[PDB]
């Protein structure tokens, strides 16, 4: 007797669209990480991911509560010598909120080969229109 | 008809001769001999020596159809070495295997 | 019955061989310690 193990190739992963439009960033990030990791599915397997492709819309519309409107700041090492070119979150969201959403997901998601593999499964777009309409992405809210 | 040729106690390094020998594995004799004749390494002389010995032996023991012969396996190994006051002189052992199929 | 002749039980002891292995009880130093 051996416990069933999910097959990395036979697992079926569909498309579910998510739109926050004024929801807490932390809650959305937690739910996105959990659903990408496949923990919701009864066939969860740490060996091989079984999550579903998720598309994010209206990244700039995420809601942040408290003094994080000014206190929060994102920093990424620039390398070389004196690479302390930080980036306040306001400017980053104003320019490309996709970067903010994806870095938040990466921090939430476990880091590693499988971490990057799951990260590749999550696409974040600012405009409502999505070009991945050929696969019939089902509408799901969180 | 399988044919094998080899040389014993060659005055060459074990690994230096391997570079030229790498050009004979999987290559037909027709162009292999031409490449060897124009190769600049000293080991090229020994490689062409063993190749011509092997092809001559194949022609002799076998009946005919010498052109179709294709080289299959060829490899070199380290042989006995001589000590001298501390300097060690190496020797190379080259083997070439040629078969029509 | 020639080979049936054996010493009486308990009359012969090989004796511990110090400085031979670690699984034989005493290990290195011959069992006398430092």
């Amino acid at each position: 007797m051996k416990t069933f193990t999910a097959k990395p190739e036979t697992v079926k992963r569909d498309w579910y669209v998510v739109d926050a439009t004024g929801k807490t960033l932390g809650r959305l990030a937690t739910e996105l990480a959990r659903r990408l990791r496949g923990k919701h599915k009864a066939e969860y397997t740490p060996h091989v991911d079984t999550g579903d492709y998720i598309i994010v819309l209206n990244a700039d519309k995420v809601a942040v509560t408290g003094n994080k409107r000014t206190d929060k700041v994102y920093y990424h090492h620039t390398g070389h010598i004196g690479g302390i070119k930080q980036a306040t979150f306001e400017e980053m969201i104003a320019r490309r909120p996709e970067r903010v959403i994806e870095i938040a997901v990466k921090g939430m998601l476990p880091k590693g080969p499988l971490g990057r593999a799951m990260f590749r499964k999550l696409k974040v777009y600012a405009g409502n229109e999505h070009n991945h309409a050929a696969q019939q992405p089902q509408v799901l809210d969180i | 008809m399988e044919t094998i040729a080899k040389h014993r106690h060659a005055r060459s390094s074990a690994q230096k001769v391997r570079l030229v020998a790498d050009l004979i594995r999987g290559k037909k004799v027709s162009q292999a001999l031409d490449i060897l004749t124009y190769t600049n390494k000293k080991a090229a002389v020994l490689v062409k020596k063993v190749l011509e010995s092997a092809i001559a032996n194949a022609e002799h023991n076998d009946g005919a159809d010498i052109d179709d012969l294709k080289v299959t396996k060829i490899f070199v190994d380290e042989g006995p070495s001589m000590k001298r006051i501390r300097i060690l002189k190496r020797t190379s052992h080259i083997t070439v295997v040629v078969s029509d199929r | 019955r020639l080979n049936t002749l054996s010493p009486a039980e308990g009359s012969k002891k090989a004796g511990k061989r110090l400085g031979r292995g670690i699984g034989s009880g005493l290990g290195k130093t011959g069992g006398r310690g430092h």
Partner: protein
Amino acid sequence: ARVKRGVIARARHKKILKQAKGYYGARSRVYRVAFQAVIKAGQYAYRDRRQRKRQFRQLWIARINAAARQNGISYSKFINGLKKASVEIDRKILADIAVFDKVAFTALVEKAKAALA
């Protein structure tokens, strides 16, 4: 009466190296490091034999929680309902059945919800 230890040493070396298959080169051929490598592998096997129960329990708990969330109940509430129903099904069997069957798990969660109160 001289005794030659070559045969015994060779046999011991062969026996120890036989367990040193596939250890990234030197550790699989060099006795000095091969012995340490095999000892460390044995220690790791000893630890992992006990840790396998923990890993399997973790996997079963994760699967049961996922199934319960799919059915619309938390893992703790499902366990409480199962216990209050006078049922002693191990988590391993529940996880095994949750993947090959769904109707049985639906009935189990319904019974747990009914008996929770």
